[PDB]
Amino acid sequence: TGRPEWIWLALGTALMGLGTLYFLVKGMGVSDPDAKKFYAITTLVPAIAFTMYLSMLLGYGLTMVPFGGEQNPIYWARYADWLFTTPLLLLDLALLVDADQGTILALVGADGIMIGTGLVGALTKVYSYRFVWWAISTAAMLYILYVLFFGFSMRPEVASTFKVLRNVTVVLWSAYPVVWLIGSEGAGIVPLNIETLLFMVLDVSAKVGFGLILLRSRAIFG
Amino acid sequence: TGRPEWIWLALGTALMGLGTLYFLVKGMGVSDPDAKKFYAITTLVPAIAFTMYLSMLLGYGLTMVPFGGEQNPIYWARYADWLFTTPLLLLDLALLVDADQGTILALVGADGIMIGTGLVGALTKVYSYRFVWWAISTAAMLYILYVLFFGFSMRPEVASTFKVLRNVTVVLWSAYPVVWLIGSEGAGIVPLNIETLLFMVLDVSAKVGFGLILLRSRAIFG
Amino acid sequence: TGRPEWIWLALGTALMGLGTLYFLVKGMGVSDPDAKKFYAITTLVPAIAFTMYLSMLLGYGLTMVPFGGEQNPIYWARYADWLFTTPLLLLDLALLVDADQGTILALVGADGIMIGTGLVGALTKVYSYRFVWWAISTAAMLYILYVLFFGFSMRPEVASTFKVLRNVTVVLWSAYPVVWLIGSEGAGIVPLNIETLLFMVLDVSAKVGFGLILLRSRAIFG
Numbered sequence: 001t002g003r004p005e006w007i008w009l010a011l012g013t014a015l016m017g018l019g020t021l022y023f024l025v026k027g028m029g030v031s032d033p034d035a036k037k038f039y040a041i042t043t044l045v046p047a048i049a050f051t052m053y054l055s056m057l058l059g060y061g062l063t064m065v066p067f068g069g070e071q072n073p074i075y076w077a078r079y080a081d082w083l084f085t086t087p088l089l090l091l092d093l094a095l096l097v098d099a100d101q102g103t104i105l106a107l108v109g110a111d112g113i114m115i116g117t118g119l120v121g122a123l124t125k126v127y128s129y130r131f132v133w134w135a136i137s138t139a140a141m142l143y144i145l146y147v148l149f150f151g152f153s154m155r156p157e158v159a160s161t162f163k164v165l166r167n168v169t170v171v172l173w174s175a176y177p178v179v180w181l182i183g184s185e186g187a188g189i190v191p192l193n194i195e196t197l198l199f200m201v202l203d204v205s206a207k208v209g210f211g212l213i214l215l216r217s218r219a220i221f222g
Numbered sequence: 223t224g225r226p227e228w229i230w231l232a233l234g235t236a237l238m239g240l241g242t243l244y245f246l247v248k249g250m251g252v253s254d255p256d257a258k259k260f261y262a263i264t265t266l267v268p269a270i271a272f273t274m275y276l277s278m279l280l281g282y283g284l285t286m287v288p289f290g291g292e293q294n295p296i297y298w299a300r301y302a303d304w305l306f307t308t309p310l311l312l313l314d315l316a317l318l319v320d321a322d323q324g325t326i327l328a329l330v331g332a333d334g335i336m337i338g339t340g341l342v343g344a345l346t347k348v349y350s351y352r353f354v355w356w357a358i359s360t361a362a363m364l365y366i367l368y369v370l371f372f373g374f375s376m377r378p379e380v381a382s383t384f385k386v387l388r389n390v391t392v393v394l395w396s397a398y399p400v401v402w403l404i405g406s407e408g409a410g411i412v413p414l415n416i417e418t419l420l421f422m423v424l425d426v427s428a429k430v431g432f433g434l435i436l437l438r439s440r441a442i443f444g
Numbered sequence: 445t446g447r448p449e450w451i452w453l454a455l456g457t458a459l460m461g462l463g464t465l466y467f468l469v470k471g472m473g474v475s476d477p478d479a480k481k482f483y484a485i486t487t488l489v490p491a492i493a494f495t496m497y498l499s500m501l502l503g504y505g506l507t508m509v510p511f512g513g514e515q516n517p518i519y520w521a522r523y524a525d526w527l528f529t530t531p532l533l534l535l536d537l538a539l540l541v542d543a544d545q546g547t548i549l550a551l552v553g554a555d556g557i558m559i560g561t562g563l564v565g566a567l568t569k570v571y572s573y574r575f576v577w578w579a580i581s582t583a584a585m586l587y588i589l590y591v592l593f594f595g596f597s598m599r600p601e602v603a604s605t606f607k608v609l610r611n612v613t614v615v616l617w618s619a620y621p622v623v624w625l626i627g628s629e630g631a632g633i634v635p636l637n638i639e640t641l642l643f644m645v646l647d648v649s650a651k652v653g654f655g656l657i658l659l660r661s662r663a664i665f666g
C-alpha cells in the first residue's frame with residue numbers, strides 16, 4: 001500500500017502464517033504430553049504473531065504519537081504480540097530445563113514489565129521520558145538474560161538444545177532494544193521501513209527459527 | 223432507556239446475576255477440592271458476564287465505530303467478557319476430562335486468538351477487513367471444536383456430562399459467529415436489538431444453562 | 445512539577461524502587477524453591493508498583509474524566525498496578541496456607557472483578573453510576589476478605605505469619621474503597637493530593653511493608 005514498510009509487514013504476515021501451519025501439521029500425531037506442551041506453546045507463538053503482523057499490515061495495529069515536534073507512526077501491535085509470545089518463548093526454555101515455577105514466575109513477570117514498559121515508552125508523548133522507559137525495559141531484559149544463564153544435571157538431550165536456543169535468544173532479543181533505540185520509537189536514526197524489516201527478521205527468527213530448532217529436536221520429548 | 227435493546231441488556235444483567243448468586247449459594251458447603259475447582263470457574267463465569275452485561279446496560283461497554291458509511295454501535299464489552307469466560311468454560315471441559323495442560327494450553331490460546339481477533343474485527347474501520355478478522359476468529363473457533371471432539375477411558379461419571387456439555391458448547395458457540403456475521407458488527411442484516419437478544423439467549427444458556435447442567439452432576443466430584 | 449500531588453508520586457516511586465531492589469538483593473542466594481516462589485511474587489509486586497508510580501509521576505498514567513460538571517483527573521495507572529499486584533499479594537497468602545487452586549481461582553478471579561469494576565467505575569462518565577461500580581467492587585473485596593478468614597492444621601511456622609499478614613491485608617485493603625469513596629474518583633470530599641498520599645501510604649505498606657514481614661520470616665521456607 002501507501003506505506004513503504006508494507007512489504008515487510010506482508011512478508012512477515014506470510015512467514016508467520018506458514019510457520020504456524022507448518023508447526024500445526026507437524027504437531028499432528030503427537031501424543032507425548034510433554035511434546036504436546038512444546039508444540040502448543042511453539043505453534044501459538046507465530047500464530048499470535050501472525051495476527052498482529054496482519055493487524056499492522058491492515059493498519060489497525062498502527063497509531064500516531066506526537067513527540068519531538070512530529071507525528072510519529074507507532075506500531076503498538078508489536079507489544080500486544082510480545083506481551084504473550086515473549087513469555088511463551090521463555091516458557092519453552094523454562095520447561096526445557098524444568099524450571100521451578102518460582103523462576104518461571106520471575107521470568108514471566110520480568111517479561112511483562114519489559115513489554116509493558118516497552119509499550120509505555122512507545123506511547124509516551126514526552127520525548128526524553130521515552131528513553132527512561134526504554135532503560136527500565138532494558139533492565140528487565142537484562143535481568144531475564146541474567147536468569148537464562150545464571151538463574152539455572154539436566155538430561156543431556158535437553159542440554160545442547162537448551163544452550164543453542166538460549167544463545168539464539170540472547171543474541172536476537174538483545175537486538176530488539178537497539179532497533180527500538182535508533183528507530184522510529186526512539187532517536188529516529190533508522191527509518192521506519194528499515195526498522196520494520198529488522199523487526200521482521202528478528203521476529204521470524206526468534207519465533208519461527210527458534211521453533212524449528214526446538215521442534216526438530218528430541219529435547220522436547222519424554 | 224433510549225436504546226431499544228436496553229431491555230435485553232437488563233434481562234441479561236438480571237439473569238447473569240441471579241445465576242451467579244445461585245451458584246454462589248450452591249457452592250456453599252463444598253469442600254471437595256475438585257468440586258471446589260468447578261464451582262469457582264463456574265460461578266465466576268456469569269459473575270464476569272454480569273459485570274459486562276451491566277456495563278453494556280449502563281452504556282459504558284458501548285462504542286461507535288465508523289464504517290460502511292455509518293456510525294455503528296459496537297458493544298466491545300462482549301469481548302472483555304468472552305476473553306475470560308470463554309477460556310474458563312473451556313477450562314471446565316478440560317478438567318472434566320482431565321486434559322493434559324498441553325491441550326489446555328492449545329485450547330486457551332486458540333481461544334484468546336478467537337476473541338482477540340473477534341475484537342479486532344469488531345473495531346476495524348475498513349468494512350471488508352472486518353470479515354477477514356471474522357474468518358480468522360472462526361478458524362480458531364473451528365480449531366477449538368476440533369480439539370473438543372478430536373483433541374481428546376474417562377470415569378463414566380464424567381463421560382455423559384462431558385458429552386452433553388460438549389454438545390451444548392458446539393451448538394451454542396457455533397451460533398456466535400453467525401450472529402456476528404449478519405448482525406451489526408457485520409453485514410447489518412439483523413438489527414442490533416435482535417442481535418443483542420440472540421446474544422443474550424446464547425450467553426445465558428452457555429454460561430448459566432451450561433453451568434446448571436455441570437453443577438447438578440456428580441461428574442464434578444472426587 | 446505543576447501537580448501538588450507530585451511529591452507523593454515521587455516518594456512512592458522512590459519507595460517502591462528501593463523496596464524492589466532490597467527484595468531483589470535479599471533473594472540473592474535463595475535456592476529453596478518454595479522460598480524462591482515467595483521471593484519472585486514478592487519482589488515483582490513493588491516492581492510493578494514502581495513502574496506504575498513512575499507512570500503517574502511522569503503524567504502518562506493520568507487521564508481526564510468528565511463528570512459531575514467538572515474535568516476530573518483520574519489516575520488509571522493504579523488499576524493497571526492492582527490488576528496484577530493484588531492477585532499476586534493474594535497469591536502470597538494462598539501459597540502460605542497451601543490453598544487448593546479452586547480457592548486460588550476464586551480469590552484471583554474475585555480480585556480481577558474487584559479491580560476491573562474499580563476501573564470501570566473510575567472511568568464512567570455518569571456520576572451516580574460510578575458508585576454502582578464501587579459497590580460491586582466492594583462486594584468482591586468483601587468476598588475476598590470472607591475467604592481470607594472463612595475460605596481456609598497448617599505448619600505452625602506459617603500460622604503466625606499468615607494471621608499477621610491477613611490482618612494487615614484486611615485493614616489496609618479495606619481502606620482503599622473508603623479513600624476512593626471520598627476522594628477524587630468519588631464524592632470529591634478529600635482533595636487529590638491528600639488521596640494520593642493516602643494511597644501512597646497504603647500502597648507501600650501493603651506491598652513493601654507486607655513484604656518485609658513475609659520475607660523476614662521462615663514461614664516462606666521448606
Ligand SMILES: CC(C)CCCCCCCCCCCC[C@@H](C)CCCCCCCC(C)C
Binds near residue numbers: 018200210212
Ligand atoms: C518447513 C520449514 C523448514 C520452514 C517453513 C516455515 C515458514 C517460514 C519461513 C521459514 C524460515 C525460517 C528461518 C528463521 C530465521 C531467520 C534468520 C529468517 C529471516 C527471514 C527473512 C527471509 C528469509 C526467507 C524465507 C522466506 C525462508
Ligand SMILES: CC(C)CCCCCCCCCCCC[C@@H](C)CCCCCCCC(C)C
Binds near residue numbers: 241422423428434
Ligand atoms: C436455580 C436455577 C434452576 C435457575 C436460576 C438462575 C437464574 C437465571 C435463569 C435460569 C435459566 C437458565 C436456562 C439456560 C438456557 C437457556 C436456553 C435460557 C434462555 C434465556 C432467556 C429467558 C428464559 C427465562 C428465564 C428468566 C429463566
Ligand SMILES: CC(C)CCCCCCCCCCCC[C@@H](C)CCCCCCCC(C)C
Binds near residue numbers: 648
Ligand atoms: C531494608 C528495609 C527494612 C526497608 C527499605 C525498603 C524501602 C522502602 C521503605 C521501607 C518502609 C516500609 C514500611 C511499610 C509500611 C508503612 C506503614 C510505611 C508508610 C510510608 C511512608 C513514609 C515512611 C518512611 C520511609 C521512607 C521508610
Ligand SMILES: *C\C=C(C)/C=C/C=C(C)/C=C/C1=C(C)CCCC1(C)C
Binds near residue numbers: 086138141173176177
Ligand atoms: C517476538 C519475540 C521477541 C522474541 C521480541 C523480543 C523483544 C524484546 C526482548 C523487546 C525489548 C525491548 C526492550 C528491552 C527495550 C524497550 C523496547 C523493547 C520493548 C523493544
Ligand SMILES: *C\C=C(C)/C=C/C=C(C)/C=C/C1=C(C)CCCC1(C)C
Binds near residue numbers: 429
Ligand atoms: C459467553 C460464552 C460464549 C460461550 C461466547 C462465545 C463466542 C464465540 C465462541 C465467539 C466467536 C466469534 C467468532 C468465531 C467469529 C468472530 C466473532 C465472534 C467473536 C463472535
Ligand SMILES: *C\C=C(C)/C=C/C=C(C)/C=C/C1=C(C)CCCC1(C)C
Binds near residue numbers: 617651
Ligand atoms: C496495591 C495493593 C493494594 C493492596 C490495593 C488494594 C485495593 C483494593 C483492595 C481496592 C479496592 C476498591 C474497591 C473495593 C472499591 C472500588 C475502588 C477500589 C478499586 C479502590
